[PDB]
Amino acid sequence: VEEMDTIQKMNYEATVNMGRQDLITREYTFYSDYEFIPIQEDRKQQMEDALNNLHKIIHPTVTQLKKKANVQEIQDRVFRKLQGWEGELNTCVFSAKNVRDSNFCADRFTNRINTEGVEFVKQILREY
Amino acid sequence: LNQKYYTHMEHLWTVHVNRLNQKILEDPLYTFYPQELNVPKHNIIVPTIFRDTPQ
């Protein structure tokens, strides 16, 4: 990555710097904020896997629909259930004391997605 | 005094008997323990090391 002209070097520097905004601002923390134990990386990966599993079911149905209104309606119907579950998860994770509690809440949310979310999605897609 | 709280206490006792019949000896929802029974909140949260995204 060393060998390049001035323009290429400047472009590479720009691309690198546009990704370090998270690095620069991590030093500027606020004292009065309400801190919470964050969702762990493995739980994040499990939740994203559950979301991808949901997307696996909906893909043929949404790609075989030629109307944007139907796809938007399908998106809205699932999103209400997902938003209720997300609210439960956010409450129970913000009110968490240790990493065990955060893991418990994330596991409950993932289990809700993998157990009831897929059933609800299948019912919606059968309706469509 | 009996007139004010008769129905309220009947509802409370009915809930108690229902959750005993279902063998629920766990504490109810809105139970706020004293200081000694609570879980202390872990202050030390260390953010992960920042690394550049390869993509």
């Binding site: 129970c92 009110s95 809440c105 | 766990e26 504490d27």
Partner: peptide
């Protein structure tokens, strides 16, 4: 709000175990 099961102190169960054998709550 719900108390998580691992953070739940079964105080009701502790009182229940301390009841006499011939008790209306045990009958319930």
């Amino acid at each position: 709000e719900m108390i998580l099961p691992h953070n739940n102190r079964q105080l009701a169960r502790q009182y229940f175990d301390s009841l006499p054998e011939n008790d209306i709550n045990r009958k319930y």
